[PDB]
Paper text:
Aerolysin is a major contributor to the pathogenicity of Aeromonas spp, which causes gastroenteritis, deep wound infections and sepsis in humans. It is a pore-forming toxin (PFT), which is secreted by the bacterium as a water-soluble protein, binds receptors on their target cell membrane and, following proteolytic activation, forms circular heptameric oligomers that insert into the plasma membrane thus permeabilizing it, potentially leading to cell death. Combined, these structures, consistent with the recent lysenin pore structure, describe the major steps involved in the pore-formation process by aerolysin: the transition from the monomer to the oligomer with the formation of two highly stable concentric β-barrels, the zipper-like formation of the β-barrel and the final piston-like puncturing of the lipid bilayer.
While the wild-type aerolysin pore is a membrane-inserted heptamer, a single-point mutant Y221G was found to arrest the protein in its prepore stage. The cryo-EM map of Y221G, shown previously to be a head-to-head dimer of heptamers in solution was here determined at a global resolution of 3.9 Å, extending to 3.0–3.5 Å in most parts of the complex, allowing most bulky side chains to be resolved. Domain 1, which is connected to domain 2 by a long amino-acid stretch, rotates by 180° and moves by 30 Å. Following this movement, all receptor-binding sites become ideally located with respect to the target membrane (D1, D2 and dashed line in Fig. 1c,d). Domains 2 and 3 are mostly unchanged with respect to the soluble structure (1.3 and 3.4 Å root mean squared deviations, respectively). In particular, the prestem loop remains locked in the same curled-up position (yellow loop in Fig. 1e). Furthermore, domain 4 straightens with respect to domain 3 and moves by 20 Å (turquoise domain in Fig. 1e). The high-resolution aerolysin prepore structure, thus reveals an elegant novel fold consisting of two concentric β-barrels held together by interaction of hydrophobic side chains.
Residue numbers in the entry:
A (entry chain G), B (entry chain A): 1 to 424
Write the structure that this text describes.
Amino acid sequence: AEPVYPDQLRLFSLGQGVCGDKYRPVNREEAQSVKSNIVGMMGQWQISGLANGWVIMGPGYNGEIKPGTASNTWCYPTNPVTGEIPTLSALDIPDGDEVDVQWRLVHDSANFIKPTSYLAHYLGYAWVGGNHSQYVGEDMDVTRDGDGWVIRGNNDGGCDGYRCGDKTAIKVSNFAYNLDPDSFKHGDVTQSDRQLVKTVVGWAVNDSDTPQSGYDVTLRGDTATNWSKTNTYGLSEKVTTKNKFKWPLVGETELSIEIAANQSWASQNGGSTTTSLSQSVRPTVPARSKIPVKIELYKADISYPYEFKADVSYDLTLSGFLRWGGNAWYTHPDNRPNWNHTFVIGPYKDKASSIRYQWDKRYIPGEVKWWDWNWTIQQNGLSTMQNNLARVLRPVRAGITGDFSAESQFAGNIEIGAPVPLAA
Amino acid sequence: AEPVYPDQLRLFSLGQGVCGDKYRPVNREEAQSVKSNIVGMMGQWQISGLANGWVIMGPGYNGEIKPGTASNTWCYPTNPVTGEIPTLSALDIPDGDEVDVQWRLVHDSANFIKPTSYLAHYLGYAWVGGNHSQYVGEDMDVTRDGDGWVIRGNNDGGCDGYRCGDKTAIKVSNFAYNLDPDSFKHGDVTQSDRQLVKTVVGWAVNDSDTPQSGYDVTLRGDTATNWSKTNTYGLSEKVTTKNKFKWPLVGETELSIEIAANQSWASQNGGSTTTSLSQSVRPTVPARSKIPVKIELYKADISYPYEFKADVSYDLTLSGFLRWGGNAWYTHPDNRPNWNHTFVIGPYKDKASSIRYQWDKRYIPGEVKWWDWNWTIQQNGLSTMQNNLARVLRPVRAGITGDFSAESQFAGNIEIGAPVPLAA
């Protein structure tokens, strides 16, 4: 070992270490690491062979592992399938109002409602579906409720069965918008004509019988650039980031524009940066004459149609009630209890609300304090649990667009005019 | 003297200063420095010769040292074997989830369970082993308990002996991950094509009858570089360091990237540094003409597949109970007491929890306030205590991987174009 995932084991009944094409003896230590699961796969006084002269006896023997043999055996498996919940393509939401965005998510039956509905069903929630359909997740009503949204089982009309009404409700609560730097795209980039920032004019006077070319005029240092940014459609007010994001090098010019973290995107609509550029002129004015000189400095603006994407998080809540003799809550309650459990879709917050955390720790009995994902596998089949959860946890991503402009270019002229004979 | 280690002494009984091939007279001062141990090696009224006309009388004489002689003697030893607990090769743990890492350690029977089990046994703990084995440390059950792990004696099945059940449990508690700079390794290093950061364009105008080559355009100073780092597999959130770690000079470029101490590795996923590079152009424009000039600045990224190792600490706890007439607790209690003593594996914290501290001070009776390591040597043999403790205290080391990238290269172009005859 090397972790043992319960769902990869089965039972042979053909003799002394049967085994198969892709199946090898579970040893003593391996069994013990998850014997609380293995023992649940056999009858009270059922005895089966483990490996190397060791056997596992059922519940009537307290699950005890001892030396001996049997015709039943746990010669499983081979290089195990350890597929963690697969990732899927991001769900691109057409940059709208914060509310528009949320509305689109809760009404997307093909990517949100049915996937989530099946999750509830698999966990053991009762009545996940409306009175006009025989299928889970169909005939659901979407409605808004305060700061969240509710997907409810459509109790209109008649109904047969223990406890029609009190149908499992899926509530969508908190949202967060995390801007992802690497999603930066842009449209056609424009550029303005060179603008004259400033000039300086001077005269050099050589009132003598020799050139004496020893003098100068210089400009240097700052100099400054302007940065402006717009927000196309509202959402920006709730958009934040956890890292010191900087603007990408579009075209052929890099600007030192850093975006502050933990601030609304809409709160940083511009700024000012500096740079440097010096220029000098050193004339060779001929004897008895004057020469005019100029130093000129130019700008030029560039502009983008920018777009970023932000990851959208969800808080989900599943209302009661748990089905009798058929739910995944680790205690396996049979009192038809009202539940209300929450999940965080996206970033890790704690163990209880993290589907991935729990899924990834299925091999450790001591961590099973919430939902028994091993049970859900045994009931529905590993690959269906993987696909369902993959859809539930896919990465919803919302667009953020606007305009960008900046004084990015610099140019300079140094001009020396013709000599003018004195008088000065 | 020069410390005397009790375990290096024995007793001769052949006459007036017997001695041997590798054995020489213990003198008065030497004996006194550890007479509380030496006296325990003789009967109440047993008398033996020390050296130089001095003898040591047993417990009935209060261990008194006086002038005289005897046929017994303590002519021991020679250049003593003072082997401190040897160090062993680090145990490399395949960079996983914080929990994955811990799980691998507690299930490593060949490097953790049996070594630790023997430690408990040697100290005097009772029942270190399961009901299906006759050997210490075999048939142990591993289970998780809250923030720690428990290794327990497998009380399933029957059992004979005074107090079956209440078997010594080994608990593993706190962990800490200390990143070690010197473990830095990396994979294939990549490098990008030169990217254009910026340019500046200017014109020099010489409207005169002579070249007057006296002017310039310059760029200088900052300039900045970006540093990005990723975290492959979770653990990074708990990884810290006690020193101002800086990144190694990979390839041919040194970057001034300093990692803050006492912060999670995962909290420092990037940064920004600066450097400098200036460029100047000083044209020699011919009479009555113009020349265009450019100054260009370039970047280029490099990237690593990096790996560091972190030392893993442990807090160990050994539950009761101490064996009658056979334990190492310095008072030698015989009331079958429940114990619960803890040890810190790794860094020094105090005397009580430091195995190395205590081992290294065996020669000083006044420091024996916890475990009597001299007793454990007398019972098991020095070399077995050394090997066992070496395994217990070997240095577990966990991997930390991720990606690294940075704007490390710089290049620049200075271009002077061909002259263009006026008009300007």
